[PDB]
């Protein structure tokens, strides 16, 4: 129960310390539909390994059974990749920073069939984070909420996850108050940040549809891990 006894400042520090690194792609210096999807799937596959390490460092995640850990990550893995992509693209208006050597605009997303629709939604979320001036401390809270919340409804152990979720709620409010927001501004901003999570779920589900179509049309070879993460949504 040592996650529930964390202070708000200890929750933030643990989440900041657990942050995964920013990886590079193996960019080729011509883009085909297959060559671009290959770069992205290769990057997403390597990021999934780091995401698993990160998830084990989220306070409370260790306490769950191995079956419950698999279900949460299977449910939220693409949401988690996307919120990270949207976060690191904040300071690049009109562009998505998949990697420091892979920075693309929406016209390059047209290389893949059906990709630009998801591209536009990710760009829109990035500009929304920018207009809200989302902080890194708030980002890591939101990303951990996705991990614990997205699969919690499709399961005693539920009560523990919601107690940890409540602690992250406490932490978010604490950050907003320390930042000088009024009490009314605190619950208004809390609501605004959590409603964005429904858009992130929406983008994840559209992205899962697109990945499934790429697999079913032999555009790119998916890794066995990626195939298993995709199969969990089908």
């Amino acid at each position: 129960s040592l996650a529930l006894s964390l202070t708000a400042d200890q929750m933030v520090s643990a989440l900041l310390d657990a942050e995964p690194p920013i990886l590079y792609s193996e960019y080729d210096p011509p883009f085909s539909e297959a060559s671009m999807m290959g770069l992205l799937t290769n990057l997403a596959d390597r990021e999934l390994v780091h995401m698993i390490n990160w998830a084990k460092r989220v306070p409370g995640f260790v306490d769950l059974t191995l079956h419950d850990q698999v279900h949460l990550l299977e449910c939220a893995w693409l949401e988690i990749l996307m919120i990270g992509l949207v976060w690191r693209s904040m300071e690049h208006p009109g562009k998505l920073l998949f990697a420091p050597n892979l920075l693309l605009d929406r016209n390059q997303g047209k290389c893949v069939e059906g990709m630009v629709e998801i591209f536009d939604m990710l760009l829109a979320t990035s500009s929304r984070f920018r207009m809200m001036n989302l902080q890194g401390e708030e980002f890591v809270c939101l990303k951990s909420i996705i991990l614990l919340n997205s699969g919690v409804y499709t399961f005693e152990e539920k009560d523990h996850i919601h107690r940890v979720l409540d602690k992250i709620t406490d932490t978010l409010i604490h950050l907003m108050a320390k930042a000088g927001l009024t009490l009314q501004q605190q619950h208004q901003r809390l609501a605004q940040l959590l409603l964005i999570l429904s858009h992130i779920r929406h983008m994840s589900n559209k992205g899962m549809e697109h990945l499934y179509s790429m697999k079913c049309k032999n555009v790119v070879p998916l890794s066995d891990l990626l195939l298993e993460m995709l199969d969990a949504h089908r």
Binding site: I52, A55, K56, L66, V70, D224, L225, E228, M229
Partner: peptide, 10 residues
Amino acid sequence: HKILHRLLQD
């Protein structure tokens, strides 16, 4: 089993 299953144990 599962690759995710294995990676979480490792």
